[PDB]
Structure 1
Amino acid sequence: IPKWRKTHLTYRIVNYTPDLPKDAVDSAVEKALKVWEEVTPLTFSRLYEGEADIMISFAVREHGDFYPFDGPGNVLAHAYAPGPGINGDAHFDDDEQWTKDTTGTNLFLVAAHEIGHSLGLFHSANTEALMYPLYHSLTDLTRFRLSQDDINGIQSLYGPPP
């Protein structure tokens, strides 16, 4: 089945981009995980060494897999579907300048979307959904919220929270 066999996943941030302070990166990823966690029975916990379920890293060009990055612009990041090994992993192109505001390439926004893929979600045809295929940002980050479409998609796979 297109999903995880357990309801608890471990995650590890393998390396950090120099674009933002160490703490802003942690905060971005944590918030990203939290949005999915709020609408399902799933839980997460961090590891600092070893192989975790979701291995997050920042890389440039050819980085040991089938999909080399393309330099600044265009593809910003990609993730793999549920499963062991590389599956479930999320990679970010470091040729981008990652930020924590509304100016350029917001880490939280991209990560929230990439984590959606790590949990089994496909693309939505709804222009308002987090899982919509084309990149965009928001005027105000505090106004972020998943669309019902996003909710139904994740819940059809894992069910609602108790």
Structure 2
Amino acid sequence: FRTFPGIPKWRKTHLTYRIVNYTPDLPKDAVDSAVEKALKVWEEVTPLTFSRLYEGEADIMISFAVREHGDFYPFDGPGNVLAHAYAPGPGINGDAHFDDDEQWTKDTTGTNLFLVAAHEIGHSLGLFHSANTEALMYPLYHSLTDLTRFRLSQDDINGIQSLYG
């Protein structure tokens, strides 16, 4: 690092991700589709590119879990916290955890996996929460009337561009 205090960012443009486990809420193909669409959201605005691993340890480990699951921050059952993630770095850093006590959906009926995943991947790329209620990095879940017109807000774009270009 050349700057101190450091920039919460990956020191590399190309990152790896692995969907270690899956939720029973959806077909596994729907889980992958939601995840790679959530990664595309950030890919088309930044130099970042993502490769999917199926074994080993990847930069961004995506896991579904309920309540206690091996980190400092246990989930709280249905409701409230739907997911959390970690800033870039080694080990648990960069990983995204999704509370499976929620019911994840491909559409906006229940809790849309793609919407939450795109937010948490934002955290895994180094982004903080936004005060703009329209921004994806807004912490509170906002279900959309139709995912057809989901747009990355300018605040999210500028934040991820100031990190990666």
Instruction: Give the TM-score of the pair, scaled to structure 1.
Output: 0.97
Aligned length: 159
**Displacement of 1:2:** 1.2
**Displacement of 1:127:** 1.4
**Displacement of 1:48:** 0.5
How far apart, CA to CA, are the structure 2 residues paired with 1:130 and 1:66?
A: 25
Runs of 4 or more above 2 Å deviation = none
How far apart, CA to CA, are the structure 2 residues paired with 1:94 and 1:53?
A: 22
**Displacement of 1:134:** 1.3
Structure 1: runs of 5 or more not aligned: none
**Displacement of 1:119:** 0.3
Map Cα deviations across residues 63-108 of structure 1 (whole Å, 9 max, x no partner). 1110011111110000000000000000001111110111110000
Q: Root-mean-square deviation (CA), in Å?
A: 0.6
How far apart, CA to CA, are the structure 1 residues paired with 2:85 and 2:38?
A: 14
* SS of residue paired to 1:55: strand
**Displacement of 1:10:** 0.4
What residue is the counterpart of 2:3 in the other structure? none
Instruction: Give the TM-score of the pair, scaled to structure 2.
Output: 0.95
How far apart, CA to CA, are the structure 1 residues paired with 2:68 and 2:108?
A: 29
**Displacement of 1:135:** 1.1
**Displacement of 1:136:** 1.1
Structure 2: runs of 5 or more not aligned: 1-6
Map Cα deviations across residues 5-64 of structure 1 (whole Å, 9 max, x no partner). 100000000011011011000000000000100001110001101000000000011111
How far apart, CA to CA, are the structure 1 residues paired with 2:45 and 2:142?
A: 23
How far apart, CA to CA, are the structure 1 residues paired with 2:109 and 2:117?
A: 16
* SS of residue paired to 2:80: coil
Which of 57, 66, 69 lines up with 1:60 in the alignment? 66
Map Cα deviations across residues 106-127 of structure 1 (whole Å, 9 max, x no partner). 0000000000000000111111
* SS of residue paired to 1:75: strand
* SS of residue paired to 2:158: helix
Map Cα deviations across residues 107-156 of structure 1 (whole Å, 9 max, x no partner). 00000000000000011111111011211110010100101111000001
Query: What is the percent sequence identity of the aligned residues?
Result: 100
